[PDB]
Scaffold this active site. Sequence first.
Site, PDB file in Angstrom:
ATOM      1  N   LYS A 167      -5.194  -9.790  -7.622  1.00 16.76           N
ATOM      2  CA  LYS A 167      -5.872  -9.203  -6.470  1.00 16.76           C
ATOM      3  C   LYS A 167      -6.864  -8.226  -7.104  1.00 16.76           C
ATOM      4  O   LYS A 167      -6.473  -7.319  -7.828  1.00 16.76           O
ATOM      5  CB  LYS A 167      -4.891  -8.477  -5.547  1.00 16.76           C
ATOM      6  CG  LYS A 167      -5.547  -7.956  -4.258  1.00 16.76           C
ATOM      7  CD  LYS A 167      -4.539  -7.303  -3.292  1.00 16.76           C
ATOM      8  CE  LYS A 167      -5.221  -6.779  -2.010  1.00 16.76           C
ATOM      9  NZ  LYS A 167      -4.266  -6.137  -1.063  1.00 16.76           N
ATOM     10  N   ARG A 211      -8.642  -1.229  -9.450  1.00 16.48           N
ATOM     11  CA  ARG A 211      -9.737  -2.183  -9.482  1.00 16.48           C
ATOM     12  C   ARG A 211      -9.642  -2.959 -10.778  1.00 16.48           C
ATOM     13  O   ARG A 211      -9.454  -2.378 -11.855  1.00 16.48           O
ATOM     14  CB  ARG A 211     -11.071  -1.444  -9.376  1.00 16.48           C
ATOM     15  CG  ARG A 211     -12.287  -2.345  -9.225  1.00 16.48           C
ATOM     16  CD  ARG A 211     -13.564  -1.552  -8.886  1.00 16.48           C
ATOM     17  NE  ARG A 211     -13.622  -1.122  -7.482  1.00 16.48           N
ATOM     18  CZ  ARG A 211     -14.182  -1.828  -6.493  1.00 16.48           C
ATOM     19  NH1 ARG A 211     -14.744  -3.009  -6.732  1.00 16.48           N
ATOM     20  NH2 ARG A 211     -14.182  -1.353  -5.250  1.00 16.48           N
ATOM     21  N   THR A 244      -5.374  -0.436  -2.811  1.00 14.00           N
ATOM     22  CA  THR A 244      -5.172   0.995  -2.741  1.00 14.00           C
ATOM     23  C   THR A 244      -3.728   1.330  -2.394  1.00 14.00           C
ATOM     24  O   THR A 244      -3.121   0.679  -1.548  1.00 14.00           O
ATOM     25  CB  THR A 244      -6.127   1.625  -1.683  1.00 14.00           C
ATOM     26  OG1 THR A 244      -7.481   1.358  -2.057  1.00 14.00           O
ATOM     27  CG2 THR A 244      -5.920   3.147  -1.567  1.00 14.00           C
ATOM     28  N   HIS A 294      -2.852  -3.287   7.855  1.00 16.41           N
ATOM     29  CA  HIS A 294      -3.944  -3.610   6.955  1.00 16.41           C
ATOM     30  C   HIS A 294      -4.647  -2.338   6.518  1.00 16.41           C
ATOM     31  O   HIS A 294      -4.778  -1.392   7.298  1.00 16.41           O
ATOM     32  CB  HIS A 294      -4.899  -4.568   7.699  1.00 16.41           C
ATOM     33  CG  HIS A 294      -6.324  -4.520   7.241  1.00 16.41           C
ATOM     34  ND1 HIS A 294      -6.781  -5.239   6.158  1.00 16.41           N
ATOM     35  CD2 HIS A 294      -7.408  -3.872   7.743  1.00 16.41           C
ATOM     36  CE1 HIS A 294      -8.078  -5.038   6.006  1.00 16.41           C
ATOM     37  NE2 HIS A 294      -8.482  -4.214   6.956  1.00 16.41           N
ATOM     38  N   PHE A 295      -5.036  -2.287   5.251  1.00 12.21           N
ATOM     39  CA  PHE A 295      -5.748  -1.127   4.727  1.00 12.21           C
ATOM     40  C   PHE A 295      -7.223  -1.532   4.760  1.00 12.21           C
ATOM     41  O   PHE A 295      -7.629  -2.496   4.120  1.00 12.21           O
ATOM     42  CB  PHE A 295      -5.301  -0.792   3.284  1.00 12.21           C
ATOM     43  CG  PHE A 295      -5.838   0.527   2.783  1.00 12.21           C
ATOM     44  CD1 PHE A 295      -7.090   0.600   2.172  1.00 12.21           C
ATOM     45  CD2 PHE A 295      -5.132   1.708   3.017  1.00 12.21           C
ATOM     46  CE1 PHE A 295      -7.627   1.829   1.816  1.00 12.21           C
ATOM     47  CE2 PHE A 295      -5.663   2.942   2.659  1.00 12.21           C
ATOM     48  CZ  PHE A 295      -6.908   3.004   2.062  1.00 12.21           C
ATOM     49  N   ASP A 296      -8.029  -0.799   5.516  1.00 11.94           N
ATOM     50  CA  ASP A 296      -9.432  -1.160   5.641  1.00 11.94           C
ATOM     51  C   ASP A 296     -10.377  -0.492   4.657  1.00 11.94           C
ATOM     52  O   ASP A 296     -11.218  -1.155   4.054  1.00 11.94           O
ATOM     53  CB  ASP A 296      -9.902  -0.897   7.079  1.00 11.94           C
ATOM     54  CG  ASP A 296     -11.008  -1.812   7.501  1.00 11.94           C
ATOM     55  OD1 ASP A 296     -10.866  -3.038   7.361  1.00 11.94           O
ATOM     56  OD2 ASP A 296     -12.020  -1.313   8.004  1.00 11.94           O
ATOM     57  N   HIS A 308       0.725  -1.268   0.000  1.00  9.77           N
ATOM     58  CA  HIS A 308       0.000   0.000   0.000  1.00  9.77           C
ATOM     59  C   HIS A 308       0.745   1.304   0.000  1.00  9.77           C
ATOM     60  O   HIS A 308       0.124   2.343  -0.117  1.00  9.77           O
ATOM     61  CB  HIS A 308      -0.976   0.020   1.182  1.00  9.77           C
ATOM     62  CG  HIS A 308      -1.899  -1.161   1.226  1.00  9.77           C
ATOM     63  ND1 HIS A 308      -2.940  -1.330   0.341  1.00  9.77           N
ATOM     64  CD2 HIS A 308      -1.930  -2.239   2.050  1.00  9.77           C
ATOM     65  CE1 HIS A 308      -3.574  -2.457   0.613  1.00  9.77           C
ATOM     66  NE2 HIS A 308      -2.978  -3.027   1.646  1.00  9.77           N
TER      67      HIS A 308
HETATM   68  N1  PAP Z   1      -9.034  -5.256  12.016  1.00 13.09           N
HETATM   69  C1  PAP Z   1      -8.439  -5.888  10.986  1.00 13.09           C
HETATM   70  N2  PAP Z   1      -9.149  -6.187   9.866  1.00 13.09           N
HETATM   71  C2  PAP Z   1      -8.539  -6.899   8.907  1.00 13.09           C
HETATM   72  N3  PAP Z   1      -7.280  -7.396   8.832  1.00 13.09           N
HETATM   73  C3  PAP Z   1      -6.560  -7.074   9.964  1.00 13.09           C
HETATM   74  C4  PAP Z   1      -7.055  -6.349  11.043  1.00 13.09           C
HETATM   75  N4  PAP Z   1      -6.029  -6.191  12.029  1.00 13.09           N
HETATM   76  C5  PAP Z   1      -4.993  -6.799  11.532  1.00 13.09           C
HETATM   77  N5  PAP Z   1      -5.211  -7.361  10.299  1.00 13.09           N
HETATM   78  C6  PAP Z   1      -4.164  -8.109   9.566  1.00 13.09           C
HETATM   79  O1  PAP Z   1      -3.766  -7.228   8.527  1.00 13.09           O
HETATM   80  C7  PAP Z   1      -3.074  -8.041   7.574  1.00 13.09           C
HETATM   81  C8  PAP Z   1      -3.638  -7.667   6.234  1.00 13.09           C
HETATM   82  O2  PAP Z   1      -2.838  -8.342   5.283  1.00 13.09           O
HETATM   83  P1  PAP Z   1      -3.368  -8.576   3.762  1.00 13.09           P
HETATM   84  O3  PAP Z   1      -2.222  -9.142   2.990  1.00 13.09           O
HETATM   85  O4  PAP Z   1      -4.641  -9.345   3.810  1.00 13.09           O
HETATM   86  O5  PAP Z   1      -3.548  -6.991   3.120  1.00 13.09           O
HETATM   87  P2  PAP Z   1      -4.665  -5.782   3.152  1.00 13.09           P
HETATM   88  O6  PAP Z   1      -5.748  -6.286   4.029  1.00 13.09           O
HETATM   89  O7  PAP Z   1      -3.953  -4.610   3.698  1.00 13.09           O
HETATM   90  O8  PAP Z   1      -5.078  -5.651   1.713  1.00 13.09           O
HETATM   91  C9  PAP Z   1      -3.352  -9.519   7.963  1.00 13.09           C
HETATM   92  O9  PAP Z   1      -2.245 -10.024   8.764  1.00 13.09           O
HETATM   93  P3  PAP Z   1      -1.123 -11.130   8.105  1.00 13.09           P
HETATM   94  O10 PAP Z   1       0.093 -10.281   8.041  1.00 13.09           O
HETATM   95  O11 PAP Z   1      -1.089 -12.205   9.129  1.00 13.09           O
HETATM   96  O12 PAP Z   1      -1.699 -11.585   6.803  1.00 13.09           O
HETATM   97  C10 PAP Z   1      -4.617  -9.366   8.799  1.00 13.09           C
HETATM   98  O13 PAP Z   1      -4.805 -10.508   9.664  1.00 13.09           O
END
Ligand code: PAP
Length: 124
Positions: A41, A85, A45, A119-121, A12
Site C-alpha cells: 500500500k 509513504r 496514516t 475511511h481515512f480521507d 489506521h
Molecule cells: N466518502 C468516502 N470516501 C471514500 N471511501 C469511503 C467513503 N465513505 C465510506 N467509504 C468506505 O471506506 C472504506 C475504506 O476502506 P479502505 O480499505 O479502502 O481504507 P482507507 O480508505 O481508510 O485507506 C471502504 O469501504 P469497504 O469497507 O467496503 O472497503 C469505502 O467504500
Amino acid sequence: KETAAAKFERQHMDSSTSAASSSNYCNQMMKSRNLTKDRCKPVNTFVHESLADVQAVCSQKNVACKNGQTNCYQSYSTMSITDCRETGSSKYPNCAYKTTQANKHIIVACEGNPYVPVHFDASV
Ligand SMILES: Nc1ncnc2c1ncn2[C@@H]1O[C@H](COP(=O)(O)OP(=O)(O)O)[C@@H](OP(=O)(O)O)[C@H]1O
C-alpha cells in the site's frame, strides 16, 4: 467477516504510541497490520489517539470528501499522526516506508449505526 469499522481500526488506529516511535515504525506497522499482503500500500496514516477521540470526529466538522460524498468530518483539534509513504527503492514483497510524524487535523468518512469512522480521507 471484517466490518468496515474494524478495518479502519486495523488500518489506521495506533493508540499504544503517542507518536512515530522510530525511523522504522512504518516498515514494522505496515507489515503487522497486513497492509503489505497483496501489494505495498503506497501511503497510509496511523492515528495516535484514543479510539473514543477518533470516533467522536464523526460528530465534528462536516466537510466534503475527496470523492464528492458528503459523509466526511474534520477534527476540531489537531491529532498526533504518522504518515507512511512508500520509498522509491521499495519493491514488493520487500515493501519499504518513510515514517513521518505530524500533528494535523484528520478528515474521516463515517457510516452506519453507530456512526463510526470507516475511511481515512486526509489530514490538514
Ligand atoms: N466518502 C468516502 N470516501 C471514500 N471511501 C469511503 C467513503 N465513505 C465510506 N467509504 C468506505 O471506506 C472504506 C475504506 O476502506 P479502505 O480499505 O479502502 O481504507 P482507507 O480508505 O481508510 O485507506 C471502504 O469501504 P469497504 O469497507 O467496503 O472497503 C469505502 O467504500
